[PDB]
Amino acid sequence: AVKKVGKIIKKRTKKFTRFQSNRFMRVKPAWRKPRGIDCRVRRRYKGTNLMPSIGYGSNKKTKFLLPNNKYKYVVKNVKEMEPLIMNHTKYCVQIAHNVSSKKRKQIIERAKQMNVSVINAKARL
Amino acid sequence: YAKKIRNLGKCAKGAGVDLRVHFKNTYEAARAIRRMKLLEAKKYLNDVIEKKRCVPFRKYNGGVGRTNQAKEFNHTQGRWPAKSCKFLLNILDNVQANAESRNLDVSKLRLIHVMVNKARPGRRRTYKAHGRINPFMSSPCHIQIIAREINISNQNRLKNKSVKKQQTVQ
RNA sequence: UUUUUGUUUGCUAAUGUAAAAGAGAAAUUAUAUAUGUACCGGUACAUAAAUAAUCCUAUCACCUUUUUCGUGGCUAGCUGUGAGCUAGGCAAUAGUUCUUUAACAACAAAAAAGAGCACAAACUGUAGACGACUUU
RNA sequence: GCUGGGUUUAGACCGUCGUGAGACAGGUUAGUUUUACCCUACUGAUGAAUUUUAUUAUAUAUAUACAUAUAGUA
RNA sequence: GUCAUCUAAUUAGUGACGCGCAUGAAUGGAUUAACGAGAUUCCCACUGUCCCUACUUGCUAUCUAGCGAAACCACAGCCA
RNA sequence: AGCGUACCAACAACCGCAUCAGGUCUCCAAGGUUAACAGCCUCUGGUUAAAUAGAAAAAAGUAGGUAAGGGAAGUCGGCAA
RNA sequence: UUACCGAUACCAAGCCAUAAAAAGAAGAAAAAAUUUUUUUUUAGAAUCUUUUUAUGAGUAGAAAAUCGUGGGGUUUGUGUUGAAGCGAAAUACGUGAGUUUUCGUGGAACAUCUCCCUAGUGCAGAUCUUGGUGGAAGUAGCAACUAUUCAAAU
RNA sequence: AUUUUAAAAUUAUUUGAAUUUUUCUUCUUAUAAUUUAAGUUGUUUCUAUACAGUACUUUCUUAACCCACUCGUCUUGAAACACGGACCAAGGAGUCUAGCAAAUGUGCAAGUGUAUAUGAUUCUUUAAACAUUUUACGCAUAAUUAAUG
RNA sequence: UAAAGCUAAAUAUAUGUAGGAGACCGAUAGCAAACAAGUACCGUGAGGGAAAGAUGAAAUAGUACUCAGGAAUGAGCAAUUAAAUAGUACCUGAAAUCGUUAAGAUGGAACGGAUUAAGAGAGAAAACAAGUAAAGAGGGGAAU
Ligand SMILES: O[C@H](c1cc(C(F)(F)F)nc2c(C(F)(F)F)cccc12)[C@@H]1CCCCN1
Ligand SMILES: [Mg+2]
Ligand SMILES: [Mg+2]
Ligand SMILES: [Mg+2]
Ligand SMILES: [Mg+2]
Ligand SMILES: [Mg+2]
Ligand SMILES: [Mg+2]
Ligand SMILES: [Mg+2]
Ligand SMILES: [Mg+2]
Ligand SMILES: [Mg+2]
Ligand SMILES: [Mg+2]
Ligand SMILES: [Mg+2]
Ligand SMILES: [Mg+2]
Ligand SMILES: [Mg+2]
Ligand SMILES: [Mg+2]
Ligand SMILES: [Mg+2]
Ligand SMILES: [Mg+2]
Ligand SMILES: [Mg+2]
Ligand SMILES: [Mg+2]
Ligand SMILES: [Mg+2]
Ligand SMILES: [Mg+2]
Ligand SMILES: [Mg+2]
Ligand SMILES: [Mg+2]
Ligand SMILES: [Mg+2]
Ligand SMILES: [Mg+2]
Ligand SMILES: [Mg+2]
Ligand SMILES: [Mg+2]
Ligand SMILES: [Mg+2]
Ligand SMILES: [Mg+2]
Ligand SMILES: [Mg+2]
Ligand SMILES: [Mg+2]
Ligand SMILES: [Mg+2]
Ligand SMILES: [Mg+2]
Ligand SMILES: [Mg+2]
Ligand SMILES: [Mg+2]
Ligand SMILES: [Mg+2]
Ligand SMILES: [Mg+2]
Ligand SMILES: [Mg+2]
Ligand SMILES: [Mg+2]
C-alpha cells in the first residue's frame, strides 16, 4: 500500500522482485522485465508479481529525500564536506564505506562543526 | 567447531577427520545419541554393536527394514550400523580421554553437539551395461563431538490510565 | 480445594484463545387452527393468535443504628448469604476521548490441606517376507 | 502383462507390371518385443499423533453445557 | 472357387476339375529315389500344452552386517 | 662370437575401458564302468577360490522335479516337456 | 416495480511519466526569544526552472533516456586505524536496472557520475560447454563355476 | 517578490434611484475591514519531560480473506496429454573489415582530401604529432551518345 | 631488336632465434601447453590429446611437547605465527547440496501477488528539547 509519513508519500514500499525468483535459485530477485509469449506477468493476470512502472514514482518535490527530509550526499573527504556548508538543512552526509577510522572520525567532527547530519556515524565506533 | 560455547572450561571436544563409514548410518547414530550423558551414549553404542538395541532410521528411512527394537523410540524402522557405531564409539572414547586430561567428571558430561558432515567421496569405478563406467564412490564423513558438564517504561498518562483501571477493578 | 504473585547447554518460572460485556430466556403441536382444564380419541369450558413488536434481569455504592423474612451450616440460639424497611450525612474529582486492561481456559511458583505396567529377552507357532499377531 | 500368427525393415521365391533399378492397397516363407528401484493407484503390512477438540447424557424427584473429558497400559 | 476326401464339425491338408485377373517349357516345364536344425497337414506313441491347478528343491527376492551405483527428474504428484 | 633364458599363458599377469562367466595356438594324458580320449565316480598333481557373508524360508521370479483321470480338448503351430 | 451489489470503464481529488501549451536572463518573509539576537530559507542549472491541460493497453518492431561490467585519456580522491571480494542485512535512495551504507569475514589494492573515449560489456534456457552437486537412495544390486566346518597361530 | 491582485460576496457606515414595500430588497457614490473570494486551518491531547522498551520505523515469519496453472518456445491457439529445462557456478551469441547509403555531427567549400613519399633541432611516450618541396590522383565542377564524338 | 646469360637496391616474411611493445588475455581467458605439455592417457595405425598456478614477510617459523588412541587422527592447561576456520587438498572460499541449533508451519503439493496480523529480529540520520546557567576535558581563530 501507500506509506505516508510526513508530506513524504511513498507509493510502493515493497520491492518489485523478478518473476519466479522465488521458484528457481538461479533467478535473482533483481527486477528483470519478462519478455516472450505467455508471460502472465507481461499479461498482468490477477495474482502475479507486479511490473514496475512510471506511475509508481515519487513526487518530483520530495523524491530523493530520505525520512529525514535531507538529500543524502556521499562524503569521501573534508574537501567534499565543504560544498555543503551553505546546505546543512537540505543535504545530510554519509561517509564513504571505504574510509579508514581516523579519517571517518575527522569527518564526523567536521560535520558536527557544520551542524550537518551524518546518516552513518557509528561505523567502527 | 560449530557450536556457540562461551565457556570451554566445562566442555570437552573430539573430532574425526575422514571416516571410512557411510554418512547416512553415522548421521542416524549421531541423532540417536544426541542430548545424552556420555556414559549412557557409550552404553547405547555398545548395545547397538552387539545387536541388542537399534538406532532408529528416521531421516534416511528409504528401504530400511522394520525391526522389533524400534518401538523404544516410537518408530517402526531401525538398524544396527556396526562399523559406523564402532567409529562413533572410538570418537566418544577419545572425547572421554580428553575430558579426563582436563578436569571434567565423566558422569556429568552430556553430548551437547554431535555433528556429522559429509567428507569428499573416495572415487572408485563400477562397470555396467554395454561398456559403461560408473562412479562407485564412498560417502566418508567428518564427526564433531562436544561434551559438556551439566548440573521498563512509565509514561504519566499511561500510569494514570492504569490507576483508573485498577480502581474500576476494585 | 482454597489463597497469593505471576506467564511485561536448547530450554529448566510460565500464554493461549474464530471470538464475554446481560453472548438472559427448556411446553408441545397444528398451519383450512392449536393448547390446557374437567369429565367419558369424544364432549364442555377457558386460553395464545405483529406469539422475542415479549418477558426476565440490571445501577438501590458507604459503613454504622433500628428491625423483618427466606435459604445453608452446627448443638430455640448462634454464624454466613440473599431481599426489604428506618436513621446518620458520607466517597468518588486524574484537568476533552484514544480498549470500558473487567471473560474464559491453561499453566508456573509460593505456602496450606488431604492420599504399576509395557517393550525388550528368551519361549511359542493357532502367525509370519520384516514388522505385527499367538503364546509361555 | 504376455504372445508375435498377420501387417509394416533388411534375406528369399512366385505371378503380373516396368527397357531397367525396382513396383504390387497380389500371393508365400524366414525374420532381437528393452527398462519399475521413482511418484501415484491398487493389494496386503506396520504405525505415531489428534483441547476450539469432543459429548444422544451424568449426578444424588431436583440438578447441571456458566458442564464434564486426566494420561498410560490392557 | 465346384465335387470328392480327412473331422462330430476343415477360410487348413490332400486328390480332382480349369476360357489360367495374370501357368508354362534352360525366366527352364513336367516328374522325381536319397538327403534337409527346410515349408506345410494328418495319424500313432507320448506327455501338466490344457482341463485345473497343486506340492516341492536349489538359487534370488526378504531381514541383517558390510559395501553401494544408474536411467530418469520444470515443479510435482487423489479423484469426477 | 652375439643375442634370448624371471614369471604369467588366463583360474585375476594377454585382448576384450576392469582382478570382465567371453575370446586365444600347441604337446604330454592314469584307475574304474564302457564301444569310447563320451558321461558318471576315483589316484597323481591342483584347489576348497571365485565383486560379499549370516539369518529366515512369504509372494514373485529363475534352473528344476512330480503329479489322479483324461491325452493337444491348449496354442498361429505339439512351442516346451 | 423498486432497492441494492458490482469493474483496471466513468466522475471528483492527488501523485508519477509523456505530449503539448503558457512563461521566464533580483527581492526579505516569518517564527521564537528578550528594541536586539537566534532559527530556517533569501531560487534563475534553457533538453533548465515554474505553472497549466490532456493523455498512459501492447507481441513483432523502432526510438529515446538511463544503468552496469573490462580497459584508456582526463579530473580528486579512498586504503594495514584494512582495499577489492565475498555472506547477511539496511527507519536507505531510486518506478527500475541498480546505487549507496551497516555488521561479519577478508588481507591488498580500489575508484570516478567531472567529461568521453574503447571494448571479447550484462544470460534462466540453446537434448548449450566445463566443472561441481542433488532427489532417486542407503535403494537396484554384490545369485555361473555343487560346500564348507572346527581348532589353533599371527 | 503584485493576477493569494482586480473584482465577487459579507459586515458597519454614506449618496441617489427603482416596484419585486421587503431586519438577506436591489442596483450605485465613497470608506474601512473581513471570507462565502484567494485548493485547511485552529484548539486540546498524546508520543513525552523519551535515546529505545513491549511504544514508534522497518526487515524477516508465519497465519488469515481473495486471487494466482511451469517458464522459455514455435504456433490461429500452450497450463497443456507439444518440445527444451534435475540443480548450481563460470563461460556462452548481430561482430569485424571492404565498398555503397541515407541520417546527423564537424571542417573546409568550386573545391576538397596532402596518397604514397619526403622534411625535421622527431625520437621513454613518438608506430604520433608537426611540416609539404625555395598542373600527382580521387571524387566533385557537365551532360549526353554505341559510337568518330 | 626474340629464339644465349648475369646483375645490388627498394619489396615479402603465420618459420627459427634474439630483442623491444600493447587502450591485448588474466588460469573454463591467453598458444593445446603460466605446472616434469605436445606431457600423461587413448588409438593396430595415420592420428587424437588433456587436467593441473597462488600457505606466509619468513618454513634457516611446515606443526615441538603432553594425553587418548593398534594406527590414523583427535584433544590440550601446550606451540610456530600478526593470523592456523593461513596446516601444505594450504589466499579469498560464492552457489547448488548437506549437517547442527533455534523458531515456525504442516488433512493429497509447495511457492507466489494483493492486504493486514501476530511474532521475531533490527534501528534513532524526521520519529521532542534550540539555546541559558553552573564546571570538567579538549580544540581553534582573532585582537594587541
Ligand atoms: O542574464 C543576466 C546575465 C548576465 C551576464 C553577464 F552579463 F554578466 F554576462 N551573464 C549571465 C550568465 C552568464 F553568462 F553565465 F554569466 C548567465 C545567466 C545570466 C547572465 C542575468 C540576469 C539575472 C541576474 C543574473 N544575470
Ligand atoms: Mg500468445
Ligand atoms: Mg507457455
Ligand atoms: Mg511374425
Ligand atoms: Mg522382406
Ligand atoms: Mg486340423
Ligand atoms: Mg490341391
Ligand atoms: Mg508368362
Ligand atoms: Mg546342410
Ligand atoms: Mg547423478
Ligand atoms: Mg622358465
Ligand atoms: Mg620357476
Ligand atoms: Mg578371465
Ligand atoms: Mg583398449
Ligand atoms: Mg572373478
Ligand atoms: Mg496327468
Ligand atoms: Mg493315449
Ligand atoms: Mg486345436
Ligand atoms: Mg482353442
Ligand atoms: Mg520340441
Ligand atoms: Mg505504453
Ligand atoms: Mg569495483
Ligand atoms: Mg560476447
Ligand atoms: Mg546459467
Ligand atoms: Mg531467454
Ligand atoms: Mg554436466
Ligand atoms: Mg482460485
Ligand atoms: Mg499448429
Ligand atoms: Mg521441435
Ligand atoms: Mg527433459
Ligand atoms: Mg541442460
Ligand atoms: Mg555469465
Ligand atoms: Mg553526410
Ligand atoms: Mg636471372
Ligand atoms: Mg587453459
Ligand atoms: Mg595487522
Ligand atoms: Mg577464514
Ligand atoms: Mg594474499
Ligand atoms: Mg582456504
Calculate how far, in angstroms, residue B59's C-alpha sits from the geometric centre of ligand 22.
45
Q: Do B96 and B40 meet the contact criterion of CB atoms below 8 Å apart?
A: no
Residues in chain A preceding a C-to-N separation beyond 2.5 angstroms (breaks): none
Q: Do A99 and A121 meet the contact criterion of CB atoms below 8 Å apart?
A: no
Report the distance separating Cα A101 and Cα A95, nearest Å: 11
A46: Cβ–Cβ under 8 A, 6 or more apart, which residues? none
User: Which protein residues have any CB–strand C distance under 7 A?
Assistant: B 3-7, 35, 52, 65-72, 76, 110, 112-113, 148, 150-152, 158, 160-165, 167-169
B169: Cβ–Cβ under 8 A, 6 or more apart, which residues? none
Q: Do B16 and B161 meet the contact criterion of CB atoms below 8 Å apart?
A: no
Kind of pairing between the strands at A3-4 and B109-118: unpaired
* B132 in contact with nucleic chain F (CB within 7 A): yes
Report the distance separating Cα A108 and Cα A75, nearest Å: 10
Which nucleotide is closest to B84, CA to C1'? E66
B1: Cβ–Cβ under 8 A, 6 or more apart, which residues? B13, B15, B113, B115, B144, B146
b/e string for A2-41 if b means 16 or more Cβ within 10 A?
eeeeeebeeebeeebebbebeeeeeeeeeeeebeeeeeee
Q: Dihedral angle at the C-alpha atoms of B103, B109, B112, B114, nearest 10 degrees?
A: 90
Report the distance separating Cα B89 and Cα B84, nearest Å: 9
The label of the residue with cell 546546505 reads A87
Q: Do A85 and A65 meet the contact criterion of CB atoms below 8 Å apart?
A: no
* B101 in contact with nucleic chain I (CB within 7 A): yes
The label of the residue with cell 572421554 reads B96
Estimate to the nearest angstrom the gap between the alpha carbon of A91 and the chain centroid.
14
Between residue 132 and residue 161 of chain B, the positions with Cβ below 7 Å from nucleic chain I are none
Task: Name the DSSP letter for residue B95.
Answer: H
Task: Name the DSSP letter for residue B12.
Answer: E
Report the distance separating Cα A104 and Cα A76, nearest Å: 9
Report the distance separating Cα B80 and Cα B58, nearest Å: 13
Calculate how far, in angstroms, residue A47's C-alpha sits from the geometric centre of ligand 2.
19
Q: Do B23 and B116 meet the contact criterion of CB atoms below 8 Å apart?
A: yes
Report the distance separating Cα B96 and Cα B89, nearest Å: 10
Kind of pairing between the strands at A71-75 and B109-118: unpaired
Asked if residue B44 belongs to a known ligand binding site, the reply is no
Q: Say which amino acid occupies B15.
A: A
Alpha carbon separation from B93 to B45, B100, B151 (Å, rounded): 11, 10, 22
Alpha carbon separation from A75 to A22, A120, A125, B16, B77 (Å, rounded): 37, 11, 17, 51, 64
**Neighbour-count burial of B167, counting CB atoms closer than 10 A to its CB (0-12 exposed, 13-18 middle, 19+ buried):** exposed
Q: At what angle do helices B82-101 and B23-33 cross, to 10 degrees?
A: 50
* Solved with: cryo-EM
